[PDB]
């Protein structure tokens, strides 16, 4: 009843958090959903001697993800599983201190993303299959089939090297590409420190939620941090004075958390725009920009 006199603070915080939650799905849609059709590979897998079995989807897995995608998903430890609990496992109370249920009891919840990992893998599979089977044409219009040797010759002719350099060295170039994919596998299976850019995305939200839980133990100058204790031990006249401090302190902590979430959402939106630009200009075509997509000639 006393919180109703403080105005539209809760409604504007909820509006900002709803805007951030819509913006995350907009970022994911903008990055991944760039092709209007779901292309797929032919059953034969002879792409001019190049081996694409590590990045093509594996049907043996329950979710159609490739070997490298499975390696990345195993490398990232996703600790922010909010609605996987579904509050039944939180209602069954355990003596172990579970961090997701403890913050779930405090009003802090995590909404699931709109696009699941299966749909993201289907988007990446369609993009990679269209890239392999058609080149740059499916980013400009209908996909046009072309042999992969002719496509590699045309990619070399883009960077100023004639086609006979490929057509007299195609087996060597395929061997180098397969060895590079194998070295990518050997690097990702051992060096787990490369995915810190996503591990920090997990940790910056987990630490913020843990801090927001830890702010309740602060007294903010009151006699206690338990409002039932204050109401049971004081009259209403000085109890309102004691409880106004707690209400103002917790509201300021919530506003601080919302402001930091807004700044982090701005940074994440900038990174998502960069990722969408990189996808459109390097997956859907060849880039002449120096060091935009890898050191060397793209």
Ligand X SMILES: *[C@@H]1O[C@H](CO)[C@@H](O[C@@H]2O[C@H](CO)[C@@H](O)[C@H](O)[C@H]2NC(C)=O)[C@H](O)[C@H]1NC(C)=O
Site residues for ligand X per CB under 6 A: 51, 53
Of 28 and 205, nearer to other proteins (C-beta) is 28
* Three-state DSSP state, 216: helix
Integer CA distances (angstroms), 179 to 131, 138, 184, in order? 21, 28, 9
Long-range CB contacts for residues 116-119, cutoff 8 Å, separation at least 24: 117/63, 117/65, 117/73, 118/63, 118/64
Tokens of 196: 């810190």
Of 4 and 46, nearer to ligand NAG (C-beta) is 46
* Residue 86 in the binding site for ligand NAG (CB under 6 A): yes
Choose among ligand NAG, ligand X, other proteins, none what residue 280 binds, the Cβ cut-off being 5 to 8 Å by kind.
other proteins
Say how far apart CA 227 and CA 240 lie, in whole Å.
10
* Residue 266 in the binding site for other proteins (CB under 8 A): yes
The CB-of-180 to other proteins minimum distance in angstroms stands at 21
Find the residue with minimal CB distance to ligand NAG. Answer: 86
The CB-of-104 to ligand NAG minimum distance in angstroms stands at 14
The CB-of-44 to ligand NAG minimum distance in angstroms stands at 4
Q: Are 50 and 148 in contact (CB under 8 A)?
A: yes
The CB-of-258 to other proteins minimum distance in angstroms stands at 9
Of 107 and 296, nearer to other proteins (C-beta) is 107
Say how far apart CA 9 and CA 282 lie, in whole Å.
44
Determine the interface stretch with other proteins among 93-101, 215-223, 229-237, 241-249 (rule: CB under 8 A).
241-249
Q: Are 108 and 228 in contact (CB under 8 A)?
A: no
* Three-state DSSP state, 50: strand
Restricting to residues 107-126, name those near ligand NAG by CB under 6 A: none
Among 10, 14, 18, 37, binds other proteins (CB under 8 A): 37
Choose among ligand NAG, other proteins, ligand X, none what residue 64 binds, the Cβ cut-off being 5 to 8 Å by kind.
none
Say how far apart CA 33 and CA 276 lie, in whole Å.
10
* Three-state DSSP state, 64: coil
* Three-state DSSP state, 266: helix
Choose among ligand NAG, other proteins, ligand X, none what residue 70 binds, the Cβ cut-off being 5 to 8 Å by kind.
none
Restricting to residues 1-60, name those near ligand NAG by CB under 6 A: 44, 46
Q: Is the dihedral of CA 168, 169, 171, 173 positive or negative?
A: negative
Of 147 and 182, nearer to ligand NAG (C-beta) is 147
Q: Are 263 and 20 in contact (CB under 8 A)?
A: no
Say how far apart CA 65 and CA 281 lie, in whole Å.
24
Restricting to residues 143-202, name those near other proteins by CB under 8 A: 143-150, 153-154, 162-164, 167-168, 170
Build a one-symbol-per-residue string for 113-142: x at contacts with other proteins by CB under 8 A, - elsewhere. Answer: xxxx-xx--xx--x--xx--xx-xx-xxxx
Site for ligand NAG, rule CB under 6 A: 44, 46, 86, 88
């Amino acid at each position: 009843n006393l919180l109703l006199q403080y105005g539209s603070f809760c409604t504007q915080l909820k509006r900002a958090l709803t805007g951030i939650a819509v913006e995350q799905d907009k970022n994911t849609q903008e990055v991944f959903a760039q092709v209007k059709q779901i292309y797929k590979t032919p059953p034969i897998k002879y792409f001019g001697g190049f081996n694409f079995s590590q990045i093509l989807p594996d049907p043996s897995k329950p979710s159609k993800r490739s070997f490298i995608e499975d390696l990345l998903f195993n490398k990232v430890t996703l600790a922010d599983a909010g609605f996987i609990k579904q509050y039944g496992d939180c209602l069954g109370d355990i003596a172990a201190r579970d961090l997701i249920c403890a913050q779930k009891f405090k009003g802090l919840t995590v909404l699931p993303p709109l696009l699941t990992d299966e749909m993201i893998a289907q988007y990446t599979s369609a993009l990679l299959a269209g890239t392999i089977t058609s080149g740059w044409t499916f980013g400009a219009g209908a996909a046009l089939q072309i042999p992969f040797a002719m496509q590699m010759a045309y990619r070399f002719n883009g960077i100023g090297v004639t086609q006979n350099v490929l057509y007299e060295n195609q087996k060597l170039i395929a061997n180098q590409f397969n060895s590079a994919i194998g070295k990518i596998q050997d690097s990702l299976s051992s060096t787990a420190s490369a995915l810190g850019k996503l591990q920090d995305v997990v940790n910056h939200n987990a630490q913020a939620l843990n801090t927001l839980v830890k702010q309740l133990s602060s007294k903010f100058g009151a006699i206690s941090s338990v409002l039932n204790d204050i109401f049971s031990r004081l009259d209403k006249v000085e109890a309102e004075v004691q409880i106004d401090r707690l209400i103002t302190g917790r509201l300021q902590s919530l506003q601080t958390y919302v402001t930091q979430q807004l700044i982090r959402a701005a940074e994440i939106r900038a990174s998502a725009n960069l990722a969408a630009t990189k996808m459109s200009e390097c997956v859907l075509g060849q880039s002449k920009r120096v060091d935009f997509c890898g050191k060397g000639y793209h």
